[PDB]
Structure 1
Amino acid sequence: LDAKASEHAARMTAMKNATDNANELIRTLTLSYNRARQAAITQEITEIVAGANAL
């Protein structure tokens, strides 16, 4: 009984820690994704305008 209780508590704690780590990783990846999206828009518009005014 003591072993089963300890196993359940350990599983609960490990899953809580894993969930927190996954949430933090999601936040960092979202920040990086937004920066990449802004950079892509900047590059495409710069190329568009350079080609347009190169005539």
Structure 2
Amino acid sequence: ATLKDITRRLKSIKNIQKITKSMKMVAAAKYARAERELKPARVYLCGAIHSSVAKQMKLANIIYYSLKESTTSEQSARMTAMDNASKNASEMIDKLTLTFNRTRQAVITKELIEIISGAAAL
């Protein structure tokens, strides 16, 4: 580990955490809209969405149905997913900072010990 290496990840996981957090607030928004619009229609990085259909994969009246549903489920899915992604990014920003400060400290002591070692051998 290098303070410069650790500061890169930290720099970036700090961003990924804010992006991810922002994407959920959006995902919640659309999902609000959707649960309402969903109401009526039944009387007629998105989580494991596209795959769930993909695996098990191998009019209008119903087309608007599967659609009006597949969007509540999706905006639902993206929401929670991005909710845990920043939950993960946060455990990491807190984890990396500790590695950063252990190293930061360690680097300073290591140097001084080198100086002191050389001074003392004169």
In the superposition, the TM-score normalised over structure 1's length comes to: 0.94
Which residue number in structure 2 is paired with residue 34 of structure 1? 101
Alignment of 1:1-55 (within 5 A): 1-55=68-122
TM-score (norm 2): 0.44
- Decide which structure has the larger Cα Rg and report it: 2
Greater helix share, structure number: 1
Q: Which has the higher contact order (CA 8 A, sep 6+)?
A: 2
Query: Which consecutive unaligned segments of at least 5 residues does structure 1 have?
Result: none
Give the letter for the 1:39 counterpart: A
Shift of 1:2: 1.3
2:26 is matched with which residue? none
Deviation by residue 1:2-50 (Cα, 9 ceiling, x = unmatched): 1111100100100010011001011101101100111111110000011
> CA–CA distance in 1 between the matches of 2:71 and 2:117?
68
Question: What residue identity is the alignment partner of 1:11?
Answer: R
CA RMSD of aligned residues (A): 0.7
Cα distance in 2 between the residues matched to 1:51 and 1:45: 10
